[PDB]
Ligand binder design. Structure first.
Ligand code: ZN
Length: 257
């Protein structure tokens, strides 16, 4: 099945998922000098006060922190978006070392990791329907650099030992994703895709300019996870990022100058 290795990684995905070579694939490199400042872009509205996290899952590729999305409790609106998008899950992508891990790049700079908060457009009723539409998802992407610890990340870090291997999950209630945000909501935006199979071209990407800082110890705990299942040969969960894809006929817009 697909993964991140030599034998099943991003350069292979197009065989089972031909949309891998499509017209609006993600991630991309953000060329800061080419991105157009767009004064029509509104401030992002991130409303996570009523977010209900439920569970954390090691899915064999990353770990997902899952939310109750049965009502409008944690939503993303404004920015480049029309309508209301409900938070379903967040996850990360990270590297074997601090010099790689992010999926988007900024003037070819790779960050140590990238957080994706995934939200679906409520006008399509459920996530499975939303991913079939070109405006079905909004993914908020946040870079991670290594330096000072992120206090609001530590609860995530300290549950990882309980979900070491693929298919393990744990209760993860009352987690506040506001603690993962940077100070500024300045962003870049462009139309793209899911960055892992099925690679569906359903995402409005919103990538924050300001990275969050996490500690080396925090990221090291991400790197102790396993791609494999319980008792199987240990394969550390590292380098679970897709590289930058061709921009093709797309414009990256900035909310700031
Ligand atoms: Zn992702």
């Amino acid at each position: 099945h697909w993964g991140y290795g030599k034998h099943n990684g991003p350069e292979h995905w197009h065989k089972d998922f031909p949309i891998a070579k499509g017209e609006r694939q993600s991630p991309v490199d953000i060329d800061t000098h080419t991105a157009k400042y767009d004064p029509s872009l509104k401030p992002l509205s991130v409303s996570y006060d009523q977010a209900t996290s439920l569970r954390i899952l090691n899915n064999g590729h990353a770990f997902n922190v899952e939310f109750d999305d049965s009502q409008d409790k944690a939503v993303l609106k404004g920015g480049p978006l029309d309508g209301t998008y409900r938070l379903i899950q967040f996850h990360f992508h990270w590297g074997s070392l601090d010099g790689q891990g992010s999926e988007h790049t900024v003037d070819k700079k790779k960050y140590a990791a990238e957080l994706h908060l995934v939200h679906w457009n409520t006008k399509y009723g459920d996530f499975g329907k939303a991913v079939q539409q070109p405006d079905g998802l909004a993914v908020l992407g946040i870079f991670l650099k290594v330096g000072s610890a992120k206090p609001g990340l530590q609860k995530v870090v300290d549950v990882l030992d309980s979900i070491k291997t693929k298919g393990k999950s744990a209760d993860f209630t009352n987690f506040d994703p506001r603690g993962l945000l940077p100070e500024s909501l300045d962003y870049w935006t462009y139309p793209g895709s899911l960055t892992h199979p099925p690679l569906l071209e359903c995402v409005t990407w919103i990538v924050l300019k300001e990275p969050i800082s996490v500690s080396s110890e925090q990221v090291l705990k991400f790197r102790k996870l396993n791609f494999n299942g319980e008792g199987e040969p240990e394969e550390l969960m590292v380098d679970n990022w897709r590289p930058a894809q061709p921009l093709k006929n797309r414009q990256i817009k900035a909310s700031f100058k």
